[PDB]
């Protein structure tokens, strides 16, 4: 075959890979602390997202959307524009169970938070 794997490998990998578990260990272990971490040259994006598919990286919108820096307020659209279509992917909670820990837990968030705060500012809003 040109791509085949057993359930444990297939599902666990799919669920994990798609869900937060796979991405959790892969990105965590690969990246090493998601809160902190910034790369220069890149497709502008791809990785470090709340269970969102790596999409939305436009050609001409980079500045418009990537206005997060100055007009940091405007980016509010980036979420107010197409989100109403993703804001239905909530059931992912059950899958995104891990979303539960950081929700009903959260540790490697408050800490990096005090730095993030410094490393960026916090001058932002999130829901
Ligand atoms: S950290 C591993 C990783 C991240 C990303 C930039 C999405 N990649 O292409 C690899 C798989 C190398
Ligand atoms: S990891 C950098 C990054 C990309 C994008 C998905 C746009 N983000 O929300 C952050 C700022 C985490
Ligand atoms: S589980 C990730 C998370 C943390 C917090 C900031 C409390 N949240 O609202 C979500 C659930 C997105």
Automatic annotation (TrEMBL):
InterPro entries for the chain: DUF5073 (IPR031816)
Keywords, alphabetical: Membrane, Transmembrane, Transmembrane helix
Pfam families per the UniProt record, alphabetical: DUF5073 (PF16817)
Spans traversing the lipid bilayer: 12-37
UniProt keyword Membrane, yes or no: yes
UniProt name for this protein: Possible exported protein
């Amino acid at each position: 075959m040109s791509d085949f794997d057993t359930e444990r490998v297939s599902r666990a990998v799919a669920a994990a890979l798609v869900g937060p578990g796979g991405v959790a260990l892969v990105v965590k272990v690969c990246a090493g602390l998601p809160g902190v971490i910034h790369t220069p040259a890149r497709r502008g994006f791809f990785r470090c997202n709340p269970e969102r598919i790596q999409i939305g990286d436009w050609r001409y919108e980079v500045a418009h959307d990537g206005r997060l820096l100055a007009a940091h307020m405007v980016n509010g659209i980036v979420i107010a524009e197409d989100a109403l279509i993703a804001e239905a992917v909530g059931p992912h909670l059950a899958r995104a169970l891990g979303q539960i820990v950081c929700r009903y837990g959260a540790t490697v968030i408050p800490n990096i938070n005090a730095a993030i705060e410094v490393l960026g500012t916090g001058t932002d809003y999130r829901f």
